[PDB]
Design a protein around this ligand. Sequence first.
Ligand SMILES: CCC(O)(O)CCCCC[C@@H]1NC(=O)[C@H]2CCN2CCCCCOc2ccccc2-c2cnc1[nH]2
Ligand SMILES: [Ca+2]
Ligand SMILES: [Ca+2]
Ligand SMILES: [Zn+2]
Length: 368
Amino acid sequence: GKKKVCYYYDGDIGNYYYGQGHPMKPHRIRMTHNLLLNYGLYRKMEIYRPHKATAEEMTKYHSDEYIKFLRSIRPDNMSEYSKQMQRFNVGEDCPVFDGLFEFCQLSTGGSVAGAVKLNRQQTDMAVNWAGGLHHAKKSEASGFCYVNDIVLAILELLKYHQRVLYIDIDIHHGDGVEEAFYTTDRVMTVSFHKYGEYFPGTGDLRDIGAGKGKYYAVNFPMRDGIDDESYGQIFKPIISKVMEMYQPSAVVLQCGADSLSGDRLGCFNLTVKGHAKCVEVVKTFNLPLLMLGGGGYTIRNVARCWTYETAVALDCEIPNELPYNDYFEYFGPDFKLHISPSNMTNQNTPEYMEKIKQRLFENLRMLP
Ligand SMILES: CCC(O)(O)CCCCC[C@@H]1NC(=O)[C@H]2CCN2CCCCCOc2ccccc2-c2cnc1[nH]2
Ligand SMILES: [Ca+2]
Ligand SMILES: [Ca+2]
Ligand SMILES: [Zn+2]
């Protein structure tokens, strides 16, 4: 039936600024929070302020040198770190900004605290919209991500769970998470993403893991314009087959909203209902679930998406008419929660979708 939901948020998160022109806007986390508060979604959730994750907690995955660099670099001392900035990929995608380390600490803190709460069996679902920064590598920042909160949260879940399933619906391939667990069978990574002339360039359907991890990495490459009907047609059957064969005891779901129609960086055509259908599908398996944020660059749509997905987690129906809120003007001209898909062509033909699904099913037959 209905589940206990714990939600992680720090009121300072929305103040971190990547810089003029950078599409990553932490303010979208504050817009999501304000919208869900105005819908009354706080009445049924336990709301927690995450602790600032320590450099030591971060080094359970990242190298000591990389975390030391992140804790030391600032816009005023950048000139003395030109060498380390190149080595750690800090530059245009991953700039140095005021409070960078504290932003990482809050993003990570929410994910790890949620994983601890799930491990203690004190909640059925834990939500951290500030997390889901899937591109960060052991000693390298990548694609707007500096610390891989997902990998750290999964390592925490692995203390009490033999098998953990990671599912990523961000439009970009979840490369940092896949790479971290590529050679183990204790984590199965499943990523649905745009593939072909698109960042990060990885996630081919032939990338299936290595060594003990062979068959434990699953990639569903897609083309521009995927819609609710097409996405829905493959998501449930793939996730159902993965649940059946892998039998995970905990799940982490990265809910990157850049797979929505009208995204500034994405080229998919999902609606908020289509995107949220993934949360409904995963929730139906009744396993401990950590829901995380990720991409999303048309910020009014990110707020709508994550507000609706929090309502889905709580099994609460919310009206389409948006309640008045601190950012009401951002939701014009309609002031509605749900969005309409565009007229963009869906390059993913029904035959292509079935063919890729059948190839993934062949790989899933190889599990013990
Ligand atoms: C949070 C999780 C996530 O949503 O998955 C992160 C997605 C990360 C995408 C990284 C990718 N980066 C690139 O294509 C890099 C490699 C060559 N370019 C150069 C960097 C350009 C400047 C910074 O970037 C932008 C600035 C303005 C507008 C768009 C971009 C941009 C678009 N795509 C990129 N960057
Ligand atoms: Ca993905
Ligand atoms: Ca794996
Ligand atoms: Zn993305």
